Design a protein around this ligand. Sequence first.
Ligand SMILES: Nc1ncnc2c1ncn2[C@@H]1O[C@H](COP(=O)(O)O)[C@@H](O)[C@H]1O
Length: 576
Amino acid sequence: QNHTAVNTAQAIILRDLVDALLFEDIAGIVSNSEITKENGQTLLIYERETQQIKIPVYFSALNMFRYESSQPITIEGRVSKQPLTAAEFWQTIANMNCDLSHEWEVARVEEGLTTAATQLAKQLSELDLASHPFVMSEQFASLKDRPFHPLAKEKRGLREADYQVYQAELNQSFPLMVAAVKKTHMIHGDTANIDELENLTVPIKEQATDMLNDQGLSIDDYVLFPVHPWQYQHILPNVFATEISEKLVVLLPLKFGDYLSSSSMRSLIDIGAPYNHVKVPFAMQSLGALRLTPTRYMKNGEQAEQLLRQLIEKDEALAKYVMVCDETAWWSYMGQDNDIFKDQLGHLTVQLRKYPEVLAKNDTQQLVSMAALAANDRTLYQMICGKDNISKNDVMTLFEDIAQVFLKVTLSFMQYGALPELHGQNILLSFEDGRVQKCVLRDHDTVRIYKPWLTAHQLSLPKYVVREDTPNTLINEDLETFFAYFQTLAVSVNLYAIIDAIQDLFGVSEHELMSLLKQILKNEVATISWVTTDQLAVRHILFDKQTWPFKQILLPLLYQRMPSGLTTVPNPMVTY
Ligand SMILES: Nc1ncnc2c1ncn2[C@@H]1O[C@H](COP(=O)(O)O)[C@@H](O)[C@H]1O
């Protein structure tokens, strides 16, 4: 057992837990503590019931307190000289708030923190970096996962053997499996060519044909769907119990191909075609939510991808930098009722993601997800810069370049009333000679829209399949809500996680990196032709307003038996 990897992994889950508690002010850890200073070190004194915690803190570039992770936390009465685990600190906080703990899921958060530390230790210990740079960058994005989130590495439903095979970090390949779906009971994308799906499963077509013939069924009546081996074993026999009885779905115990997981365990990589990914259902619980893409989201992603391509034609900045993944080739089960809203449909789908050909025929450019750059590891920075000897001025110049192209592209989209979900996992940067050449968008199912701006530019609204006269996350009814998903995902999570990584790796101040980010944002907002009636509101929300919205990730996990939530935190752009 690698004891260095266990201690390193335990310290990462503790740091993410304490920071996540401080950002959301869980049990008044900030608001009901006193700021003091013992021997040049700022401390939160959290006193409650009869216990006391001393947290070493520093005022971060988000204008909130963060855990000074170099210094140890002091719990009054704890005589143990060993490092604090995240599970122990959580248990201490829960026992200090007996009134609150009642209505929280204390038991499984404690278990999830233990799992997160165990599985991350495994992945640090047995990290096997792939030879292909894009596959390798996806391993680092998977290793880091959702930043400032202590339960990110917990994958509920996965047994210990499932972690070993499906986690991208360990570099183990696995086959796909087959389910015959009757042609009468399925739909597909408007421009989805069946030839491409047939090409996927063609090696086992003859074996599948024989298996159906030993059952009184004909392959001419069915379409062969790839199924994830976990989805195949644990989910499909139950969710399609009646459909399997009626011979509408047939689970063929076939195995074909050789697939690695990406940053997502749903989007799979064939090493023979590493820019042609296969997305399949994997009904497990990541970040407290059941990882399930409903069939209507793929129909929405088709309408969204269509809008994104119109803005790339229209805008000068988007034409230069932005490319998008083709996700139009998708197939899904469809019950005889023709109710696309049914949750069942999401468990039996297949979606082909074609990355731009320009990249796949360029072996010199390195495709790196912005999630991968948040990983506390030199590998990707040394590859991009082209040297081990990375100076302070090198990485600052590199961050300025990433922040300039990202914030220009993001705000250039937003002026028209369109906002892709731009956390680190959905956007990739094409690096060449240490500079950002291109941005590559993927997962287009959550492109948010502001109708008044789309109407002002005379753009057709995406024909989103949504519940009739009911509010949803896709259509934002005011500018505060529209800019919230930029302020949270793009700046406070994505860009700040890259700042957090660069500080850990190269010792550059996060304050100097935030000043660099702040100035780029001011330059972009000033030079974009906003709808003139709303220009003052854009400036107010970002720069002048005393609060920013913050996406809640811990408090939902305490409430779930998955609630959505924004709360107010201080404006990082404000100096006060
Ligand atoms: N904001 C985020 N930043 C980084 N990684 C994320 C973020 N949100 C989700 N992810 C990860 O990326 C994956 C998203 O793809 P999927 O799980 O297939 O829906 C999940 O497995 C998450 O662990």
